Design a protein that fits this description.
The PDB classes it as translocase. Keywords: Legionella, Dot/Icm, Secretion, T4SS, translocase. The entry is titled "Legionella pneumophila Dot/Icm T4SS C1 Reconstruction". Chain A is DotD. The structure is cut from a larger assembly and holds chains A (about 140 residues), B (about 90 residues), C (about 60 residues), D (about 170 residues) and E (about 290 residues). Chain B is of the alpha+beta class and about 90 residues long. Helices cover about 35% and strands about 25% of the residues of chain B. In chain B, α2 links the parallel β1 and β2. The termini of chain B are far apart. In chain C, about 0% of the residues lie in helices and about 45% in strands. Chain C is globular, with a radius of gyration of 10 Å. Chain C starts with a strand and ends with a strand. Chain E has about 290 residues and is mainly β. Helix content of chain E is about 0%, strand content about 55%. The chains are: A alpha+beta (about 140), B alpha+beta (about 90), C mainly beta (about 60), D alpha+beta (about 170), E mainly beta (about 290). Chains D and E meet through α6 of D and β23 and β25 of E.
Chain lengths: ~140, ~90, ~60, ~170, ~290
Amino acid sequence: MKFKKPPINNPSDDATIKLAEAAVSVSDSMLEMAKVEKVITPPSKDNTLTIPNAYNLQARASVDWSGPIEELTARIAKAAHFRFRVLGKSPSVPVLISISTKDESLAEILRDIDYQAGKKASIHVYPNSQVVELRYAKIY
Amino acid sequence: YSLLNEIAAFLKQFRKIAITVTSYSSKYVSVKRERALTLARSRVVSEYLWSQGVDSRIIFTQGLGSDKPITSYTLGGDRSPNARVEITFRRAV
Amino acid sequence: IIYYIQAVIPGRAWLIGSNGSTLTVREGSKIPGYGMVKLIDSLQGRILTSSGQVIKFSQ
Amino acid sequence: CFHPPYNNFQPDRRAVKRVGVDTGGGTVGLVASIYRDSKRKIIRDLQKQDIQYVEYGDTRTLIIPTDKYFMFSSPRLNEICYPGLNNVIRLLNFYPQSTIYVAGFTDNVGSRSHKRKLSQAQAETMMTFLWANGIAAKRLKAEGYGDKNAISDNAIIHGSAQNRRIEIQWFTS
Amino acid sequence: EVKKQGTSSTRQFRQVSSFNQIVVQGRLNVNLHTGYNKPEVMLRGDPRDLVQVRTIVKQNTLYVSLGQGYPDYGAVTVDIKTKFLNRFRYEGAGVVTGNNLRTSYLDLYLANEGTTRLAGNIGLQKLEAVGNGVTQINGVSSRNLQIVLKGDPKVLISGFVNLRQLDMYGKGTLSLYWIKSDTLTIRAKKAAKIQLAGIVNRLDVELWDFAQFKGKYLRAQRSFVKTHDKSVAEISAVNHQSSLATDASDIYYYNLSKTRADFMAFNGSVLDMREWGQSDLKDFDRYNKQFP
């Protein structure tokens, strides 16, 4: 009758212990402040209006990217068989994105890119003309 | 899964940016049933390849159904030579 | 008052209201606060009114 | 023989293999069979894997770690650990009248709705796996609790690992 | 015991006592009514066979059928008016038509090619169709109903039904427009066609071979579905979906439920089979995402 308790994993490093302890505190600070911002200014509009879906926007992708926005958007448009268009001047300080997902549709990839672009750039999709259009902000 | 492991061990030898996985099948019931079938097949295969350590930045998956045959002899079922999955890429530098 | 659909068949539709009052609607009939129904869609869960608004499924 | 993914949900004819390697003695094959289909060796095999069994009164409980029986942060079931699941079906085959409750638990990291939804998904997956192996739908119920009633302390690493679990309770009558 | 030759169909009026059950046999047509008048029966038939047309009454039951044997008769037309009806049985290859009926509960027993029309509001708890007969009931409002079919009926019912159980063993076809039920158990065996739509809290489905369940437009909260060889299912789960397909059988869903769990055994398959072109399709979450 040997006694045992169920989770028996691989051994752990105390560096990873300390890193995990810092990360948990960062995480609930982020959660509390996000709750406050949602309460203070409730959003009203959604980018499904600017990026609707279509047929052959339902091919799927998994992505690991850590660079500027324009080349990645060009790769997605080329995989979706759409034309690619740029409006405005690119800024001198580049617009950097970071996406790490698994198995989602190309429309949601563009919507996540659109959310991370923020105040610097925007994504529009015209399905009747089959055009993906990225436009830069009139800042600087 | 031994064959998929062998293919993953082949894919780790190169350096690359994007991989495309596309699945094609043969005509059974309607257009929709095999479009759904090929999409499901490509989703599962690309997931196991991503689970193993292929160092790609993008994997695209699509399923074309039975739209693009490579052979006019269509007498088999799944035994037919034109029900297949194709993995294509470009070697980078 | 806001109206939602409940179950959709080609030809007939079953709607539930904000107050829990059921209704059965044809292709073209009288609905108050929405107007005239001109299209019943079955593959899509949408019905169109003459006032320019669409009734869909609940979330 | 045996098909490794769940044997196409068929009961595996396990005893004939032992009595074929021992007739290839018949009495020794019957003694080896009647030892390994007994309840205590099955309980020891779940003890050999990472599954805990507790019996107190006429209530019985199985404790299952999600760390080894699910893939990471998903409701998908980990297919390398199929011997444990087959042994769970074999042990649960001994009580064909009782009702079953399966409950899911997570730790304290994350948001509340996220914890509740993940618990509900994992409990349904394990209930569906139980239902697909022959158990009737009127005998089962699944519930997902969040970080509701923990069994260890969430401020330390190993106790927090011990808190993420699936509970299976069943009665006798 | 006489045949029907040499006599044409004439008009007859006869008076009948109170009755709350009708049993009809023979090759004929019957029209029903309901009024606050006296009980009566209308017989269009041959004056020679108006005697063979038997209208007997035993303990509030009316027996409108053949009397003094059946060698041969071709045409019998019966119209009827009364106040209460609680059981109707018909056998023997004919036509029954009626409307504007009101009841608390009554029981149908239709057999052997009875072409039947009902156009009232009938709240019935049991129904039986025996073989090879189409049925078209327009308007049923019952709080309970149990249907079992054994031959080859072609039935379609309209209204509002709180159905509880269903067992099918033949080449029966059935369709219902609206059901607002609480728990369904379906067992289908040989080659049956079922077409439902409505709201169901809990669904259990068993298909054995060559059976088709057209459960699209039936929005269920919990679904448990098991399919065996060469059977077809259409599922519309909303909250929780649990499915198993064993060998060369197919399950197709049409909605994305909040929790999904599917299993495959030999050659069975569960496929998505949605649109891909709707403007507001929703994708998988962390919590839906299972890989077939």
